[PDB]
Nucleic acid binder design. Structure first.
Length: 187
RNA sequence: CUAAGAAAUUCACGGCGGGCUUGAUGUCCGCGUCUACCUGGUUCACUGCCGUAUAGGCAG
């Protein structure tokens, strides 16, 4: 939008696709989760759904000051020695449809869905008939894993973004702040 | 377009009485199993969820 950023994670053993570098792709958004910051546009610049990975670099869409000096949260650590590092730049001057990043798009509703199936004062024999498992179905959400209390290794993810605009502006805010609808950088 | 072409074996029955298998025995003796290794390929496509409705500070 106003200042699009990137973060290069270098290749190594510890950043392979198993659990040292698989789970740090859709759950490591501590700059928009824990390290400080909540009003950015999530726009991953590696949206290639063939490998099920909607982001290659650490693509983030922010403003001019938020990309130049207002993006110093702890959500960019590990790239000091175990990877490379990025910096801020200008926003998309052309019309890039980069309204897709790590956002609140995901289909893991079976983690707590017994209240929507059989926790409504009934027994447990209606966990798929009254309220089905159709929302707790894993699908091809192109997005890196997550490292929360769901497995010792990484997890699943998704891309909660859509189209992008033609001007320079941060779009709408989802759970991950995925800046869909705003003209972020296309890649 | 075939060693082609076709076809109901059925009904009924008491197997049964008896038995001492015993005696004795030295398995001995000897040995090098070593050498290396990422389980971070999710132990529920998940552990709690507002409406099963890709609805999330989702605890990611």
């Amino acid at each position: 939008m106003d200042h699009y950023l990137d973060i290069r994670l270098r290749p190594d053993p510890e950043f392979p696709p198993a659990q040292l570098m698989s789970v740090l792709f859709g759950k490591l958004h501590q700059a928009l989760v824990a390290q400080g910051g909540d009003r950015i546009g999530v726009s991953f610049p590696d949206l290639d759904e063939s490998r099920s990975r909607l982001g290659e670099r650490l693509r983030i869409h922010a403003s001019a000051d938020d990309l130049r000096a207002l993006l110093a949260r702890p959500w960019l650590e590990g790239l000091r020695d175990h990877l490379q590092f990025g910096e801020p730049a200008v926003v998309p001057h052309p019309t890039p449809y980069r309204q897709v990043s790590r956002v609140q798009a995901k289909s893991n509703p079976e983690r707590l869905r017994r209240r929507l199936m059989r926790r409504h004062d009934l027994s447990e024999e209606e966990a798929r008939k009254r309220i089905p498992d159709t929302v707790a179905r894993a699908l091809d959400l192109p997005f890196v894993t997550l490292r929360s209390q769901s497995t010792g290794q990484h997890f699943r993810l998704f891309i909660r973004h859509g189209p992008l605009q033609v001007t320079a502006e941060e779009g709408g805010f989802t759970c991950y702040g995925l800046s869909k609808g705003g003209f972020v950088p296309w890649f």
